[PDB]
């Protein structure tokens, strides 16, 4: 049984192959990390060399035990293929992960809308991103989904814009409405005066004349400015005699 | 018929091959489980070696009965392909399974919304997850569908937030409304006082001034806090003389 | 024409091959069925060996009539491919079939919602499942569709939960409403008293105060309990002086 | 030009091949049809042997005129592929055809809903099914679409169920309504008395108390039973003093 | 440079090949057309032989100028593939074309709904079908889209059915309404009397009792019959004292 | 280093190959354009010969520097594949381009609806088509999208059709309405009198009898004819005493 | 160990190969950029030569250490494939990037609607485009999504068109309305008088006669022209006695 020496040689090739593979791959993503590339991209590109070299090792090692070479390419091909399917979704998510962290279209702490759902971002991980909805629900979105959909980022821009729509009665003085609104926003310090300050009659409406006011503020103030400017419009408009109308209806009677 | 000895040799190769395959694969996912990896990924990765080794055995075993080698790669290729299709959905679900149990974006017992449907999670199994809708229906969702959709988790966060929207009549005292609401929530112990406590005039409405109140509580209290705070608002507002308005309408008569 | 003996040999190989194939395959899913596996997975896995072995037979049999071997892998490849396409939908449905019967996410006789349509399940067959809509329509849903969609099962859980929403007039006594509702459900024996028994003011509404009552019962009782508890609320509420309000409207007259 | 004899030999192989192919294939689906299989599956499976055998013939026939063998597998591969694409939709529809005729989830003459459209089935053909809408439009639905969608069959079940929803005024006697409805259905002979006979107060409604009546009848009677039982409810209810209410509205006047 | 004679031989093979190809293919779809098959399917199937034979010619012709054979299968494979993609949509549409003309699910001149859009068909061409909307817009629908969607054909059936829904006031005589409607349709000659003639109380409605009338007519008359029968119902009903009600409302006054 | 002469020979082959390729391809689409084919299809089909011939050149040229032949088919295969993906969308759009220009389902200047969006076409280019919305927005639609969706063309037909729906009060004379409308359209010269001229009572409506008028005009007149005919109906109807009704309501009073 | 000299030769080939590859590729997109092509297309096409040449180097280099050649094509094939998947989305976006910058269907600074979302474009980068919503949100859209959807460009056209719809009471003078509206727009200087100036009675409405006014202006003026022309209509219409009607209703009383 002197052809049972090839069994021993097969093992030798595998052990030497596994080590030679382990130390090239380590020694490649040592190189990549020392350039800059990206911790994850390195590990990935590296782990392909690793699994590649032990793929060669398996071919030549089995080959000394008469395993026809072109049957190893085939079996390993299938094996790889079956893994490939089972993972993929992952692979795709893994890649979106990288892109998201290395382009920061949103960063942790920004409030964003990631295709219908919106929340404050907590952390982008391997396959999935975590946000917290204003009210305290946690959402886990797959990195893949995020990257191939629109990313609406409420927070990256430093200055943002409220729009009020105020409806007043048709017999209200157009000039008076504009003046009160203009004098409310003029006096509010949190409204940026060097940017848009639109107060205008915008819509001849169903039962109300509709005025649009649009004014810019720092991103932090936007919420409080809205509320404070509203309370104000309501108070002033009442004290000044301007009526927010209820829904109207001309009814035309008929005794029958 | 001395070339009918290869038939016997073919069998020998298959039996030795089946055993050599069964014992390597067992002896591989002995190794993997002893590291840590994950019971399922072990069994799977293992069962690929297993079916791979008996794939080699079938090639060489049939090969000694003159089955052309490159016809076995082809027939088994097809066979594997036909299986592959029939399973897949399963393979994909099996993989999501792992991911879900080894990332616990939801754990058993959390209430979650898994893409339109929401219920309390019971158990994540091989291909499919089982939840129980608040009212007692059971839903069985495929692991695959779950993992590639958003996961809304109501329960992982320990503190959550009610939002009341209360509408009062236009001639109600703005300051009075804010004070009563503020004094209701101030006194409710279950409302976390070190977090958001927004009481504010939010919308000039159709037939009502709309106030928004937003207050945080432990996740367990959230439901009872809402109900208790509401009963309260209604009682106080009545005793204090504030009117929740019915829908309004100015009608403008015309005899014809 | 002594090379017209290969024609005779070609037939010999085919008949021997067809038989040797037919008796291995039978003798394989004899083995599988005796273990446990599953009658269909047996027949399927088996019928692959069968068609595989006669694939080898066709290669070697045609091969002795000078049919180039690597043209048989190709022609049969195409043939298989053309079948493969034509079937598939079936194969996919066949596989869902198995899964459904060997996981019983619903069993025959349970009422279920299989993605928009809901009925009582009758029987899961090879490719398609049959249910009967409460009113007598029959629906036939493809096993494939069912398995990759959510399965809502109304019947597997033994205890379920009604939710009543009752609207009363704003000037109704909050405490009185709660007591009558609570005393209706307290007395109903079919309501499980060791589970949730929520009676609460839930919504300040358009023209009604809305109370929510939620009570659990055995799955069988649920429908009758609802109807009986409702008739009751209506009767008691009337005799007790509580008004279910019609839609309201404050109209504000103007002679013109 | 003694190597221009191969041209003559090439033709010989083609003619003999075309005939040898035509007569095996005929002689195969002679065998299939004599078992039982199914006329189309026969013709189809058969026509694959046919086109397969002339595929071999073309390889060996061109091969004697120095056409490299592995170029014929390639060219015919492409040819087949181009056909394959152009047909497919057809192939898929052809297969659905079979399934539909050999499972009769609907048969000719049954009224069915085949994914949004519904009509009386006329005839299932090769690729497409023909139904006639109750009003006389003809619809032609592809067999493929049908088989991968739900099939709702109104007619296969022999007994079906009407549901009336009758709204009466709030001040109507609950017991009186139940009795009149119960006495209408009790006396209608076409209502199957050994099945469900539900008369019950179902919904406290907007401006009406809503009673639900559900009663089963033979499939033929269902339409006429509904109409007749309705005319009846209306007549009896009027003569008995029960009011079907118009939409209600409490209006709360304010001189301004 | 006696190995520059192969260049001249290469050309010879191409010219001879192009001609031999052009004359076989012509001489094949001469055969097909003479059987019956279909002018398009002929040209297509033919043009595959054509491009196939010049594919062989290119392999052997380049092959005598040392172009490695298995590089021509590869390059031409790619070329074909790149064409294949660019066309396809076309190929698919071309095939639908055939099917539509050779099954006439609609013919030119029939009014049809081809998935949301509906018009009178003008002409089915290579890739696209042209219809004219009742009002004069032209729509061009791809043959492919048409064939894989439902085909609603208004015109192939010779007799069709109008449905009137007439609403009358609740205090109208049920018997009187039925008689007038029945006597309108009885006298209209264009209504086919040997078919359905349903006049019935169908819906207890919001503010009207709703009668359904359904009557069949020739496809040409259907439009005019509807209009004429309607004018009639309105006239008779008025002269007979039956009221088409305006929307109703019971209002319940409250001085405040 | 006399085997470093092959490096020089490799270059020679590439330069001669690049030139021989550049001059055949030029000399092919010289031929195509001189027939008729189509400038783009020529350039495309041509540029495939071009890149094909330099593909052969690269195989044989690298081959004389010991680059294994079946590695060049493989590398270039990958290269081509990577390009293929990156382009495609383009290729598909490029093809739709041709089709659109060589079938003119719309031509520049026609107003068309290309799947939801509609505008006047300006120019169809390589990948994308440009239209101008009636109001001045510019839309750029991908040729690919256009060709696989319906094409609604408002302008190719020379004569089109307005439909007026006029509502008049229930107590209006049916004959009088028809006569005034008929006499309006009779006198309008821009209405084509040899085509449809439908004036008819069409709907017994909520609060109005609804008449439908449908009349055909040249495509240019259609817009002005509508406006002019409408102004007319309104004027005549008023002067003739016919009332366009406001929404109606029978109210049924109840003191409470 | 004189066969351990091939290990040294393997390295030599890789270093020489990496350099020879790096200098050809540099020297190719030196050529391309000097023509014109496009910076990105150059780098890409170039980087394919680069990775191609080191693919050849790896084959021959490993090949001198007995790595079977047809196993390197296979392993590298897999490696490339795994990369290919992980990237793709990127590749596709990268290509859209180019197209967008080299066709400028929108340029930085134009306001555009890119499939549901609209904002002012800031910058088109490698994979993703950035726009700023009128109100200050930032949106990041993938280049791929953009290019396969419609591109609506509000700004590339220099002149655009407002459409007012004004509703007046039914008893208003048709001629008077037209004259006032015409005289408002006649006098507005910002309205382009050499283009459309439509003032017309457009819709006989629910409770209002609806006039349509359509007038063209420079793109900059469009917003202010609308607002100014509206304020105007409202003022003039009031001073001239024309009424913008509230919603109407004929009520038909009934004591009960």
Pair G119, G112: CB distance under 8 Å = yes
E partners (3+ CB pairs within 8 A) are D, F
Asked if residue D21 belongs to a domain, the reply is yes
What is d(CA E75, CA C27) in angstroms, rounded to the nearest whole number? 48
Of F66, F71, F117, the CB nearest to G150: F117
User: Would you call F138 and G153 a contact, using CB atoms and an 8 Å cutoff?
Assistant: yes
* Residue A46 near residue A32 (C-beta atoms within 8 A): yes
> Which residues of chain B have a CB within 8 Å of the CB of A250?
251-252, 254
A 10 A CB-CB count for C104 gives: 13
CA gap C220, C202 in Å, rounded: 28
3-state class (DSSP) for residue G243: coil
Residues G109 and G38 in one domain: no
In a domain, D254, yes or no: no
Cα-trace Rg, chain B: 34
Q: Is F165 on the interface with G (CB under 8 A)?
A: no
Record the tokens describing residue G167, joined without a space: 């509703």
Is beta strand B138-142 parallel, antiparallel or unpaired with respect to D209-218? unpaired
- CA dist., res. F26 & res. F33, Å (int): 11
The domain total for chain D is 3
The reply to whether residue C254 touches residue B254, judged by beta carbons under 8 angstroms, is no
In the 8-state DSSP scheme, what is residue E150? -
Does the beta carbon of A117 lie under 8 angstroms from any beta carbon of chain B?
Answer: yes
Interface-testing mutation among E152, E170, E171, E203, with chain D (most D C-beta atoms within 10 A)? E152
Q: In this structure, are C90 and C117 located in the same domain?
A: no
A201 contacts on G by Cβ (under 8 Å): 227, 230-231, 234
In a domain, E254, yes or no: no
Cβ atoms within 10 Å of C205's Cβ, excluding its own: 14
Q: D130 and D86 share a domain?
A: no
Contact assessment for residue B149 and residue B115, using Cβ atoms and an 8 Å cutoff:
yes
- If asked whether residues D241 and D195 sit together in one domain, one would say yes
Inspect the interface and report whether the beta carbons of F157 and E138 lie closer than 8 Å: yes
The answer to whether the CB of C187 falls within 8 A of the CB of C196 is: no
Q: How far apart (Å, rounded) are the C-alpha atoms in residues E199 and E187?
A: 14
Dihedral angle of Cα C35, C36, C38, C42, to the nearest 10 degrees: 0
Could you give the CA distance from residue C12 to residue B208 in angstroms, rounded to a whole number? 94
Q: Which of C111, C201, C223 to mutate to test the interface with B (most CBs of B within 10 A)?
A: C201
Which resolution, in Å, applies to this structure? 3.5
Kindly report the length of chain D: 256
Angle between helices B72-87 and C89-101 (to 10 degrees): 60
Contact criterion met (CB < 8 Å) for E152 and D86: no
Give the count of alpha carbons within 13 A of G138, CB side only: 19
Contact F161 E136 (CB under 8 A): yes
Residues of D in contact with C235 (CB under 8 A): 174
Quote the CA–CA distance of B168 and B191 in Å, as a whole number.
Answer: 23
Return the structure tokens found at D200. 């019950």
CB E165 within 8 A of CB E181: no
Residue B256 inside a domain? The answer is no
DSSP code for A245: P
> Which residue of F128, F132, F246 is in closest CB contact with G248?
F246
- Whether the Cβ atoms of residue E145 and residue E115 lie closer than 8 Å to each other: yes
Cβ atoms of F76 and F58 closer than 8 Å: yes
Q: Rounded to the nearest 5°, which phi and psi values hold at D197?
A: -145, 70
Chain G residue closest to F138 (CA)?
G153
Task: State how beta strands A159-168 and A209-218 pair.
Answer: antiparallel
Cross-chain residue pair G73–F71, CB shorter than 8 Å: yes
Query: Touching check for F152 and chain E: CB below 8 Å?
Result: yes
- Number of residue pairs across E and F with CB atoms under 8 Å? 145
Indicate whether A124 and A171 sit together in one domain: no
- Is residue F26 within 8 Å of F47, Cβ to Cβ? no
Nearest to C167 by CA among C211, C206, C125: C211
| Burial of C7: CB neighbours in 10 Å, binned 0-12, 13-18, 19+ | exposed
Which of helix, strand or coil describes residue C70?
coil
Strands G128-132 and B248-252: unpaired
Which CATH number goes with the domain that contains A63? 1.10.287.1260
Q: Which of A164, A166, A212, A222 minimizes the C-alpha distance to A192?
A: A222
Q: Select from G164, G162, G169 the least CA-distant residue to G247.
A: G169
Ramachandran bin of G96, using left for φ above 0, alpha for ψ from -120 to 50, beta for the remaining angles: alpha
Examine residue B24 and state whether it is found in any structural domain, yes or no: yes
- Best probe of the G interface among F6, F87, F140, by most G CBs < 10 A, is F140
Closest CA to G232 of G208, G207, G215, G247: G215
* Phi, psi values for residue G108, rounded to 5°: -50, 130
From chain F, pick out residues whose CB is under 8 angstroms from the CB of G201.
227, 230-231, 234
Nearest C-alpha neighbor of C245 from the set C198, C199, C210: C210
Contact F152 E117 (CB under 8 A): yes
Residue C161 burial by CB count (10 A; 0-12/13-18/19+): exposed, middle or buried?
buried
- Is the CB of E56 less than 8 angstroms away from the CB of D71? yes
Q: Tell me how far apart the alpha carbons of residues F248 and F238 are, in angstroms, rounded to a whole number.
A: 19
Contact C244 D159 (CB under 8 A): no
| Strand locations in chain B (E) | 111-113, 118-124, 128-132, 138-142, 151-153, 159-168, 197-204, 209-218, 248-252
Residue length of chain E? 256
Q: Output the CA angle C63-C64-C67, nearest 5 degrees.
A: 35
Q: How far is CA D121 from CA C3, E147, F122, G224, in A?
A: 59, 19, 48, 61
Which positions in chain F touch E72 (Cβ < 8 Å)?
56
Q: Are A210 and A162 in contact (CB under 8 A)?
A: no
Residues of E in contact with D246 (CB under 8 A): 206-207, 248-250
Question: Which residue in the block uniquely carries the two structure tokens 């009149």?
Answer: D180
DSSP C247: P
Q: What distance in Å separates the CA atoms of residue E242 and residue F204, rounded to the nearest whole number?
A: 14
Secondary structure (DSSP) of E198-255:
EEEEEEE-SSSEEEEEEEEEETTTHHHHHHHHHHHHHHHHHHHT---PPPEEEEEEE-
**Chain CA centroid to CA A92, Å:** 15
Determine, yes or no, domain membership for A65: yes
* D94, closest residue in chain C (CA to CA): C86
- The alpha-carbon gap from B81 to the nearest alpha carbon of chain A, in Å, equals 9
**Are residues D74 and E77 in contact, defined by beta-carbon separation less than 8 angstroms?**
yes
Pick the last residue of a domain from B86, B121, B154: B154
Residue G234 CB partners (closer than 8 Å, separation 6+): A174, A201, A204, A209, G244
The DSSP string of F219-238 is TTTHHHHHHHHHHHHHHHHH
DSSP F57: H
Same domain? For G149 and G173 the reply is no
The answer to whether G227 and A199 have CB atoms below 8 angstroms apart is: no
Distance CA C78, CA F113 (A): 43
Q: Decide if G3 touches A, using CB distance below 8 A.
A: no
DSSP state of A172: S
- Domain contains B62: yes
How open is the CA angle C120-C122-C128, to the nearest 5 degrees? Answer: 110
Distance, CA of E158 to CA of D58 (rounded, Å): 52
CA angle (G36 as vertex; G151, G45 as ends), nearest 5: 80
Q: Which residues of D115-149 are buried (b: 16+ CB within 10 A; e: fewer)?
A: eeeebbbeebeebbbbbbbeebbbbbbbbbbbbbb
Q: Which chains touch G (3 or more CB pairs under 8 A)?
A: A, F
CA distances C40 to A202, B91, F128, G231, Å, are: 70, 19, 53, 78
In 3D space, the residue among A250, A256, E201, E180 whose CA is nearest the CA of residue F171 turns out to be A256
Residue with tokens 């158990």: B123
Q: For testing the chain B interface, which of C195, C200, C245 should be mutated: the one with the most B CBs within 10 Å? A: C200
Helix (H, G, I), strand (E, B) or coil at C151: strand
Closest CA–CA distance from residue D254 to any residue of chain C (Å)? 5
Q: Are F112 and F131 in contact (CB under 8 A)?
A: yes
**C51-79 burial, b if ≥16 CB within 10 A, otherwise e?**
bbbbbbbbbbbbbbbebbeebbbbbbbbb
How would you label F149-163 residue by residue, b for 16+ Cβ within 10 Å and e otherwise?
bbbbbbbbeeebbbe
Range B90-114 burial, b when 16+ CB lie within 10 A, else e? bbbbbbbbbbbbeeebbeeebbbbb
Which CATH number belongs to the domain containing residue G135 in this structure?
2.30.30.60
- C-chain residues within 8 Å CB-CB of D44? 86
Contact B48 A82 (CB under 8 A): yes
Burial class of residue F1 (count of CB atoms within 10 Å of its CB; 0-12, 13-18, 19+): exposed
| Backbone Cα Rg of chain E | 34
Residues E57 and E136 in one domain: no
HEC sequence for chain D: CHHHCHHHHHHHHHHHHHHHHHHHHHHHHHHHHHHCCCHHHHHHHHHHHHHHHHHHHHHHHHHCCCCCCCCHHHHHHHHHHHHHHHHCHHHHHHHHHHHHHCCCCCCCCCEEECCCCEEEEEEECCCEEEEECCCCCEEEEEHHHHHCCCEEECCCCCEEEEEEEEEECCCCCHHHHHHHHHHHHHHCCCECCCCCEEEEEEEECCCCEEEEEEEEEECCCHHHHHHHHHHHHHHHHHHHCCCCCCCEEEEEEECC
* Residue ending a domain, choose from C94, C122, C154: C154
Closest C-alpha among D105, D108, D104, D129 to residue D120: D108
Instruction: Give the Cα separation of D151 and D141 in Å (integer).
Output: 13
Say which of F77, F156, F252 has its CB closest to residue E251: F252
**What CATH number does residue G233 fall under?**
3.30.70.100
Contact yes or no for A249 and B249 at CB 8 A: yes
| Cα-trace Rg, chain D | 34
CA distance C65 to B156: 71
Same domain flag for E58 and E121: no
Domain boundary, last residue among E39, E73, E104? E104
CB A159 within 8 A of CB A192: yes
End-to-end CA distance of chain E: 118
Helix, coil or strand: residue F97: helix
The answer to whether the CB of B162 falls within 8 A of the CB of A141 is no
Give strand pairing partners of E74: none
C-alpha dihedral sign at C155, C160, C163, C164: positive
Q: Which of D157, D174, D248 has its CB closest to that of C246?
A: D248
Neighbours of E2 (CB within 10 A): 5
CA–CA distance from E45 to each of C147, D82, E29 (Å)?
41, 10, 8
Say if CB C48 and CB C32 are below 8 A apart: no
- Distance, in Å, from the CA atom of A82 to the CA atom of B44, rounded to the nearest integer, reads 10
Is B187 within 8 Å of B139 (Cβ atoms)? no
Whether C90 sits inside 8 A of D95 (CB atoms) is yes
* Nearest CB to B75 within list C52, C94, C105: C52
Residues G133 and G210 sit within 8 Å (Cβ to Cβ): no
CB B100 within 8 A of CB B131: no
Rounded CA gap, A83 and A79, in Å?
6
Is the same domain home to C234 and C213? yes
Q: Do the chains G and F touch each other, judged by at least 3 C-beta pairs below 8 angstroms? A: yes
With a CB-CB cutoff of 8 Å, which residues 67-86 of chain E face chain F? 67-68, 70-72, 74-76, 78-79, 82-83, 85-86
What residues are paired with D203 via a beta bridge?
D210
Beta bridge partners of G161: G216
Considering only CB atoms, C91 lies closest to which of B71, B79, B86, namely: B86
Count of CB atoms within 10 A of residue B56's CB?
23
The answer to whether residue B86 sits within a structural domain is yes
**Which range marks the domain in which residue C82 is found?**
3-104
In the DSSP assignment, the letter for residue B150 is -
d(CA D119, CA D140): 11
Q: How far is CA G74 from CA A56, A71, A86, B52, F70, in A?
A: 10, 12, 21, 18, 12
Contacts of B200 (CB under 8 A, 6+ apart): A227, A231, B178, B211, B212, B213
| Exposed/middle/buried for residue D229 (C-beta within 10 Å: 0-12, 13-18, 19+) | buried
D165 and D244 assigned to the same domain: yes
Q: Could you give the CA distance from residue A27 to residue A209 in angstroms, rounded to a whole number?
A: 73
Task: Provide, as residue numbers in chain B, all residues whose Cβ is less than 8 Å from the Cβ of C248.
Answer: 246-247
Q: Taking a C-beta distance cutoff of 8 angstroms, is the pair A248, B248 a contact?
A: no
Cα distances (Å, whole numbers) of residue C246 to C204, C253, D248, E252 = 15, 21, 6, 9
Residues 6+ apart with CB under 8 A from D118: D111, D112, D131, D133, D152, D154
Do residues F185 and F223 share a domain?
A: yes
On whether both C166 and C150 belong to a single domain, the answer is: no
Token pair for G63: 């090949």
Give me the residue from G75, G132, G245 closest to A56, CB to CB: G75
Beta strands in F64-208, from DSSP E residues, in sequence order: 111-113, 118-124, 128-132, 138-142, 151-153, 159-168, 197-204
């Amino acid at each position: 049984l002197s052809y049972a020496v090839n069994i021993v040689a097969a093992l030798a090739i595998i052990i030497v192959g596994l080590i030679i593979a382990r130390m090239i791959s380590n020694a490649v993503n040592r190189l990549m990390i020392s350039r800059k590339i990206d911790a994850t991209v390195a590990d990935f590109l590296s782990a392909l060399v690793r699994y590649g070299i032990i793929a060669f090792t398996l071919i030549a090692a089995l080959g000394r035990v008469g395993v026809q070479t072109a049957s190893v390419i085939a079996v390993l091909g299938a094996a790889g293929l079956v893994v490939g399917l089972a993972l993929q979704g992952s692979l795709s998510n893994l890649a979106a992960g990288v892109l998201l962290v290395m382009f920061r279209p949103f960063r942790a702490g920004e409030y964003v809308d990631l295709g219908g759902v919106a929340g404050t971002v907590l952390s982008v991980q391997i396959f999935s991103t975590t946000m917290r909805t204003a009210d305290g629900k946690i959402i886990v979105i797959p990195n893949g989904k995020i990257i191939a959909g629109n990313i609406i980022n409420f927070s990256r821009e430093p200055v943002r814009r409220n729009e009020f729509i105020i409806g007043v009665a048709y017999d209200s003085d157009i000039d008076q409405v504009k003046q009160i609104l203009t004098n409310i926003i003029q006096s509010e310090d949190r409204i940026l005066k060097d940017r848009e300050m639109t107060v205008r009659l915008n819509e001849l409406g169903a039962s109300s004349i509709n005025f649009v006011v649009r004014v810019w503020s720092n991103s932090g103030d936007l919420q409080n400015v809205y509320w404070d400017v509203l309370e104000r419009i309501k108070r002033e408009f009442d004290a000044a005699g301007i009526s927010f109308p209820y829904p109207q209806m001309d009814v035309n009677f008929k005794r029958v």
